């Protein structure tokens, strides 16, 4: 069974831990607790072409709380940069995350995920978001609270890592 | 010990370790990092064992932390030792080092350079000690690293890339402090000394820093050329990565001297994908960079344009067949190439065309526009639009590409998302995240294509007209054209209909192009003859198009749409013909089907008739005087048509006649107006309707709920039985048709709205405005009570307490009708498709019956709100009568007898609609001579109603969230998200109402230069100088800032700043209530809450202003502020503020008080 | 949701760019 390491990078309070917990247990988390260091959560998706497992390294987005910040990216085979559409500082900090993420692992597939799209008011409008085009990334609007596209980035990443472009999640 | 660090790294990196063990290892590593020997330990770790890549990276990270955080604490000797350690580690790079190890070493070198390089250059003739401190030998050492080995070569390239990126591309803080020394040093190291001295004038102390006299470009560019000949892909990629960041800033003489553009073009002619992408980025950077020397820019644009054949070959090589699968390796390269090509049209007016460079460039752009991908194709549409709009390119563009571009744009005007197996969807499923995004991008693409067609038809009207005539003849002689002409109903999502629709859109674009030509062409002596010829051509085209005898309703609708554009240009010449054609096309029998069953093909005929009516109204508005000559014939024809016309189209036709009556200066306006309006408005004053509108059971019976109960009993339906599973019956269809007909005839809201709005559109001067206002007065003031009563009943329908009088068998029916099914993208995992699927499934179900009843109720409420808004536009007649404010407001807001609940059962969306449609237009619709009689009787209750409604809605939302923490299912999450969004929008509407009633006071605390309008200024006199209106107004303002919404609270505080000038008018009653409430609300719920970050800063300035004013004139405020603070020294705090003139220092004093209150 | 109404100030449905003044 394939086993790909995935590093979840993003600013603080963006929803990375909430997104991982929603993928694991299936229930939304209300409170905000800063992710101390890194947490490794195994994740499995059942697809038509077999079984695929993910090692999602949920990293700290706060500087003072981060551990081996860049060191958490060694031997990574995957990545997701999560930014908040309700706060423009996260999107402005997105280029820094990509910059220090491609320094360690170069040719991995990276996905930019805009979180908290469920709310009407969003300080990062769709037009403002163009970093995916500049760096050939994939941008999937997701919402942990709403489960809008919470499975799409994993499906795209699995398609690119495994090789199959017709691979689909059957369960 | 190093063994502990190795064990901790193994624990934190192994996947089998649990999270707690990982956290313990990370804590140990963190406490290791804080040790005073961390830099030396990291250097030793990196040097001793290069085999362990992870441990070496950890040591380099320790060095990075030492050089990034503890740099200021280190003395000169420690800094020099750290620099020496970094240099030694960089010089020790071997082949076994991974890429990230090299990147980290380069990062260390760049950090040390940014924090050391150029320090001694700010002092005259610095000694050797200062030069050594300032790292004078950087260039010499960096060149030494360039020759150690090929791994050191890659390391030096990475060092240069990171250094230049941080210095120029990125807004790094450290370099920003010392930009004026770092940047010229980079220019020194990359440029030759002779070239540098031309632009810069510094002395030999700068030349000491530069080691290689010839510069660094004279090293990179020959190396890049050698790598290109040897076809070394990795070396080429690394060099282009380094070279890409060092071309915007350096002196252009270096770029020209080394022939960088030639090397970039050579890289582009290679088959390496990454090299091609970086060459594209480099070429775009060279094109868009600033040029001090215009000659160098001329050479650049000349060499780029002289290699159009090479660019065409590169594009052809990049192309691929997407039928099987798109190539992700070069599709982004294709997009980048088309983006770069689209930016070259700016330079076109500067290329001296000698070998047809401009023709080849435009041919290449057109070829790229033919790309199957819409994203790739849509990049050049802006280029084509800009080129067609401007005149610098028009003579150079018409000669080569105008016919081909027109043909492409005509061929590309198709519905991509509705074509099965279209080649564009293959790229759509990769460039777009959802089908809705693809559909809206297709809509934008077709809009830009239509813009292209319109501009071409304007510029080249003769050629475009000839081509369009030939194309239309060929299409309508084709078998698809025969199918379109010889059919009555076509599948509206199939090729025969879509092709003809595209043809009609092309015709519309051509007519719009002629309209544009009417202004674009210069007003010379030849203007009149050309305009006459164009009018003759358009009349011939219109006659040709009409003679087709098109029968498809949804396509004849588009023909009627184009009729208005034809009439705009041709004026009277075809006015009667188009009018007669529109009239006769709205009464076609269509014997094949019957229109009363609400079929799929009946909706097309209904839409066609509605479009015919609306176009009749538009034509009457445009040319009323010309219709006066033929009015009696029109009146007779319409009166003959009236029995064979539906009520909706009856109202449309009557409005058309009314427009002709009013605008065309016809005699006896009053008699015709009465004969047209009174029969339609008579239903409002019906005695049975008047007496029964005050009884809710009568309202239910008229709505038909009793008949629904009888039908349910006949079908043996029960409350316990689910309505979502019971199949529907055709008897129910007949019943709902009868009920909706009787309902629309019973309450002529549409007739009143249309008549009032279109009579308002007939106003051109004030005198006939006054006479029309007097004319509408007898028809409105006896009808307004009944409209308000209808709105009352529509509000009372949503109250659950009013349903218990109904029969038990329809208790659930009204509840199902009340709820709405609005959907949002992002508020649920479902998309639009399955939501519309749920709605479609219910059609054959009895639940759709309740849904239709609720839709009827909501439609009637929307139209009565629109009628009330239109009556506001009637002017002084709606505001001078004394009963209007109470009559409207009591109707909209139903206070329950005992409990204070604003119209129980009315959703937040309904309140949003009520506010937006009625309250805002009426509040802004008050004439400046009528505020003094309507405002003081409206606002005092209106603000109370708004405050109560907002408080109740917000309290209900938070209570439901708190007492129901975990949702039962995801549907509960969707409902909560929708409710929160609607409540936020309602609060936004309320704060907009407040803003337009008073007017805010700017974001800057000291700026109040926003000039309030006359309407805004007038209200402030009424509100602030009246206790009856003022006191409720602060309640709304106090609540608005308290509510958890950043946008309104920030805006409300800005409004309060504009109010603080006048609300504190020394009034005793105003001042006291301001004391206990506003300080309690602002300090405890806004200042002490972190959810109002931006609002906290603005409220703090407002709070400080109130604090100084109240404490100065009211000692009780100081005692009150002492109590809520539970300590502190208000008198000392007040004295410190007054002695400080700067607001920044005053803000610091308040932050201490607010923080201290937070602790207490 | 409601039905649109024509205004005499914008009854003409042409989408000509307003900024155009001459050639
Ligand atoms: N509305 C909404 N809120 C969300 C969504 N995802 C996350 N949140 C909110 O944001 C919070 C983020 O909490 P965590 O995911 O634990 O934060 P974190 O990633 O650990 O934060 P750092 O460690 O500082 O990077 C959640 O608890 C929610 O309150 C979403 O999709 N929608
Ligand atoms: Mg986190």
């Amino acid at each position: 069974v394939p086993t790909f390491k995935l590093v979840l990078v993003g600013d603080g309070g963006t929803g990375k831990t909430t997104f991982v917990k929603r993928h694991l247990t299936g229930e939304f988390e209300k409170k905000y607790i800063a992710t101390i260091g890194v947490e490794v959560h195994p994740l499995s998706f059942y697809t038509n072409f077999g079984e695929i497992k993910f090692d999602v390294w949920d990293t700290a987005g706060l500087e003072k709380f981060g551990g081996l910040r860049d060191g958490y990216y060694i031997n990574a085979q995957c990545a997701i940069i999560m930014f908040d559409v309700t706060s423009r500082i996260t999107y402005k900090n997105v280029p820094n995350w990509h910059r220090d993420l491609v320094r360690v692992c170069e040719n991995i597939p990276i996905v930019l995920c805009g979180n908290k799209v469920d709310v009407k008011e969003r300080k990062v409008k769709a037009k403002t978001i163009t970093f995916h085009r500049k760096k050939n990334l994939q941008y999937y609007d997701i919402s942990a609270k709403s489960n809008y596209n919470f499975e799409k980035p994993f499906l795209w990443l699995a398609r690119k890592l495994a090789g199959n472009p017709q691979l689909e999640f059957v369960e | 010990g190093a063994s502990q660090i190795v064990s901790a790294l193994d624990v934190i990196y192994s996947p089998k370790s649990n999270n707690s063990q990982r956290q313990e290892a990370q804590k140990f590593l963190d406490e290791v990092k804080l040790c005073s020997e961390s830099p030396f330990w990291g250097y030793e770790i990196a040097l001793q064992n290069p085999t362990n890549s992870i441990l070496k990276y950890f040591g380099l990270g320790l060095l990075d932390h030492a050089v990034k955080k503890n740099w200021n604490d280190y003395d000169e000797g420690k800094r020099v030792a750290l620099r020496k350690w970094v240099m030694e580690l960089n010089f020790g790079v071997q082949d076994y080092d991974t890429r990230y190890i090299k990147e980290k070493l380069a990062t260390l070198w760049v950090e040390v350079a940014k924090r050391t390089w150029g320090e001694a250059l700010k002092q005259t003739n610095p000694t050797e000690e200062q030069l050594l401190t300032s790292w004078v030998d950087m260039d010499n050492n960096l060149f030494e690293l360039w020759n150690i080995n090929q791994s050191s070569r890659e390391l030096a390239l990475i060092i240069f890339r990171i250094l230049f990126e941080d210095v120029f591309l990125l807004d790094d803080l450290i370099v920003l402090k010392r930009m004026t020394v770092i940047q010229p040093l980079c220019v020194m190291i990359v440029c030759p000394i002779e070239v540098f001295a031309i632009k810069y004038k510094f002395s030999d102390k700068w030349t000491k820093f530069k080691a290689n006299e010839e510069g660094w470009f004279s090293v990179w560019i020959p190396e890049l050329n050698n790598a290109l000949q040897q076809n070394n892909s990795e070396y080429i990629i690394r060099l282009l990565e380094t070279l890409k960041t060092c071309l915007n800033w350096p002196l252009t003489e270096v770029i020209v001297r080394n022939d960088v553009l030639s090397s970039l073009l050579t890289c582009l002619s290679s088959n390496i994908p990454r090299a091609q992408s970086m060459a594209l980025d480099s070429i775009h950077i060279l094109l868009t960079r600033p040029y001090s020397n215009e000659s160098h820019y001329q050479m650049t644009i000349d060499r780029v344009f002289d290699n159009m054949d090479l660019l065409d070959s590169v594009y052809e090589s990049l192309l691929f067949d997407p039928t099987d699968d798109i190539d992700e390796t070069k599709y982004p390269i294709i997009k980048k190439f088309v983006d770069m090509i689209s930016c070259l049209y700016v330079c076109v007016p500067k290329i001296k065309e000698t070998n047809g460079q401009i023709q080849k460039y435009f041919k290449l752009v057109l070829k790229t526009t033919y790309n199957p991908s819409l994203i790739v194709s849509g990049l050049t549409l802006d280029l084509w639009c800009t080129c067609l709009r401007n005149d610098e390119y028009l003579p150079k563009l018409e000669k080569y590409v105008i016919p081909d571009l027109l043909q492409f744009a005509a061929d590309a005007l198709v519905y991509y998302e509705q074509i099965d197996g279209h080649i564009s969807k293959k790229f759509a499923e990769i460039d777009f995240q959802s089908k809705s995004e693809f559909q809206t991008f297709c809509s934008t693409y077709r809009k830009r294509i239509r813009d292209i067609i319109r501009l071409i038809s304007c510029v080249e009207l003769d050629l475009t007209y000839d081509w369009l005539n030939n194309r239309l003849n060929n299409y309508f002689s084709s078998p698809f054209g025969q199918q379109v002409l010889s059919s009555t109903f076509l599948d509206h999502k199939l090729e025969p209909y879509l092709g003809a629709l595209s043809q009609y859109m092309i015709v519309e674009c051509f007519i719009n192009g002629c309209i544009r030509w009417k202004i674009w062409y210069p007003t010379g002596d030849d203007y009149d003859e050309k305009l006459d010829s164009i009018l003759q051509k358009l009349e011939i085209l219109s006659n040709q198009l009409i003679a087709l005898n098109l029968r498809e309703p949804l396509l004849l609708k588009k023909q009627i749409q184009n009729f208005a554009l034809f009439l705009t240009m041709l004026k009277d010449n075809v006015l009667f013909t188009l009018l007669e054609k529109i009239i006769t096309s709205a009464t076609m029998d269509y014997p094949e089907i019957n229109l009363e069953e609400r079929g799929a093909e009946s909706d097309a005929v209904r839409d066609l008739r509605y479009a015919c009516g609306i176009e009749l109204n538009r034509m009457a508005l445009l040319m009323p005087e010309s219709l006066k000559k033929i009015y009696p014939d029109l009146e007779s024809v319409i009166a003959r048509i009236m029995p064979n016309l539906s009520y909706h189209e009856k109202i449309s036709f009557k409005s058309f006649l009314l427009i002709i009556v009013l605008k065309s200066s016809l005699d006896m306006k009053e008699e015709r107006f009465a004969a047209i309006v009174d029969p339609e408005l008579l239903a409002w004053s019906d005695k049975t309707t008047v007496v029964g509108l005050s009884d809710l059971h009568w309202f239910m019976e008229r709505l038909g709920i009793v008949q629904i109960a009888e039908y349910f009993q006949r079908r043996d339906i029960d409350e316990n039985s689910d309505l979502l599973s019971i199949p529907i019956d055709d008897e129910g269809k007949e019943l709902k048709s009868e009920l909706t007909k009787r309902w629309q005839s019973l309450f002529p809201v549409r007739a009143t709205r249309m008549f009032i709005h279109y009579s308002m559109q007939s106003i051109k001067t004030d005198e006939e405005f006054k006479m029309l206002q007097d004319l509408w007065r007898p028809r409105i003031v006896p009808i307004l009570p009944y409209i308000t009563r209808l709105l009352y009943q529509l509000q009372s329908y949503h109250d659950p307490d009013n349903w218990k009088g109904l029969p038990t068998v329809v208790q659930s029916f009204v509840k199902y009708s009340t709820i709405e099914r609005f959907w949002e993208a992002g508020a649920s995992n479902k998309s639009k498709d399955e939501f519309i699927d749920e709605h479609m499934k219910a059609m054959q179900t009895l639940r759709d019956f309740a849904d239709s009843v609720g839709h009827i109720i909501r439609y009637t409420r929307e139209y009565t709100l629109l009628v009330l808004s239109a009556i506001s536009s009637l002017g002084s007649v709606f505001y001078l009568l004394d009963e209007s404010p109470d009559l409207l407001l009591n109707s909209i807001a139903i206070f329950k007898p005992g409990s204070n609940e604003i119209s129980p059962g009315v959703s937040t969306h309904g309140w949003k609609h009520i506010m937006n449609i009625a309250i805002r237009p009426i509040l802004k619709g008050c004439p400046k001579d009528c505020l003094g009689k309507f405002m003081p009787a409206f606002l005092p209750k209106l603000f109370e109603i708004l405050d109560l409604l907002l408080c109740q809605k917000w309290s209900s939302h938070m209570n439901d969230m708190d007492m129901n923490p975990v949702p039962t299912d995801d549907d509960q999450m969707t409902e909560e998200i929708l409710e929160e969004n609607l409540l936020r929008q309602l609060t936004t509407v309320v704060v907009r109402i407040v803003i337009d009633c008073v007017g805010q006071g700017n974001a800057n605390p000291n700026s109040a230069k926003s000039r309030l309008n006359n309407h805004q200024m007038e209200m402030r006199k009424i509100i602030f100088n009246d206790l009856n209106t003022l006191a409720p107004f602060l309640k709304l303002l106090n609540h608005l800032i308290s509510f958890k919404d950043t946008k309104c609270s920030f805006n409300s505080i800005l409004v309060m700043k504009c109010c603080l000038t006048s609300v504190l008018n020394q009034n005793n009653t105003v001042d006291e209530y301001f004391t206990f409430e506003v300080m309690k609300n602002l300090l405890l719920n806004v200042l002490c809450n972190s959810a109002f970050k931006d609002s906290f800063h603005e409220a703090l300035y407002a709070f400080t202003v109130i604090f100084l004013t109240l404490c100065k004139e009211y000692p009780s405020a100081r005692a009150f502020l002492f109590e809520i603070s539970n300590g502190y020294n208000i008198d000392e705090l007040y004295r410190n503020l007054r002695s400080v003139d700067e607001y920044k220092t005053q803000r610091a004093l308040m932050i201490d008080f607010i923080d201290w209150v937070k602790s207490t | 949701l409601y039905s649109p109404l024509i205004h005499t100030q914008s009854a003409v449905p042409v989408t000509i760019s307003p900024n155009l003044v001459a050639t």
Side-chain angles (χ1 to χ4, degrees), chain B residues 411-430:
Chain B
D411 291 346
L413 193 50
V414 299
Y415 288 77
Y416 300 104
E417 62 261 49
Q418 288 138 29
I419 290 161
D420 260 39
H422 200 277
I423 201 167
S424 59
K425 303 193 176 194
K426 316 297 162 71
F427 300 95
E429 60 181 30
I430 100 106

Side-chain angles (χ1 to χ4, degrees), chain A residues 16-17 34-35 58-61:
Chain A
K16 305 184 304 288
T17 316
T35 306
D58 179 22
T59 56

Side-chain angles (χ1 to χ4, degrees), chain B residues 64 80 489:
Chain B
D64 203 327
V80 167
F489 293 97

Side-chain angles (χ1 to χ4, degrees), chain B residues 1083 1103 1107-1108 1110-1112 1114-1138 1150 1153 1156-1157:
Chain B
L1083 182 58
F1103 204 35
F1107 172 84
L1108 301 174
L1110 291 194
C1111 292
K1112 202 187 155 258
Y1114 298 97
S1116 49
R1118 305 186 190 179
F1120 173 69
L1121 284 161
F1122 183 85
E1123 186 177 2
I1124 44 92
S1125 71
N1126 313 283
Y1128 214 80
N1129 198 335
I1130 304 304
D1131 283 312
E1132 182 169 4
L1133 185 62
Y1134 174 78
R1135 279 178 283 134
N1136 293 348
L1137 286 168
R1138 191 173 179 186
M1150 313 302 72
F1153 171 66
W1156 176 88
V1157 168

Side-chain angles (χ1 to χ4, degrees), chain A residues 30 36 39-40 57 67-68 70-72 74 99 106-107 118 120 136 139-141 145-147 160, chain B residues 12-13 19 22-23 26 57 165 170 238 274 328 332 433 824 826-829 965 973 977 981 985:
Chain A
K30 302 284 182 67
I36 199 66
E39 334 204 341
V40 181
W57 290 55
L68 313 179
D70 289 58
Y72 291 147
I74 295 172
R99 179 161 56 52
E106 218 201 335
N107 288 332
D118 55 275
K120 206 45 58 171
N136 204 35
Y139 166 63
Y140 276 144
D141 257 10
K145 200 170 145 185
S146 180
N147 295 11
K160 301 301 290 187
Chain B
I12 195 167
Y13 272 98
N19 279 316
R22 190 166 280 107
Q23 292 288 355
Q26 171 69 57
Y57 194 90
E165 182 168 89
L170 304 184
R238 296 320 176 184
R274 283 270 290 283
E328 318 101 323
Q433 67 188 359
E824 187 37 46
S828 46
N829 52 34
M973 200 69 69
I977 294 170
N981 294 7
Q985 288 154 65

Side-chain angles (χ1 to χ4, degrees), chain B residues 620-663:
Chain B
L621 278 172
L622 286 176
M623 314 216 48
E625 275 286 331
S626 296
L627 291 172
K628 167 177 59 189
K629 328 291 175 68
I630 204 66
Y631 179 81
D633 289 336
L634 298 192
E635 192 176 87
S636 179
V637 163
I638 284 187
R640 185 256 298 167
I641 283 169
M642 282 286 73
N644 304 0
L645 202 58
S646 57
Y647 183 79
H648 185 284
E649 271 299 291
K650 204 173 296 179
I651 298 310
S652 298
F653 272 53
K654 281 191 179 190
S655 173
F656 159 79
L657 288 180
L658 185 74
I659 292 295
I660 307 165
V661 162
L662 293 181
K663 276 197 75 175

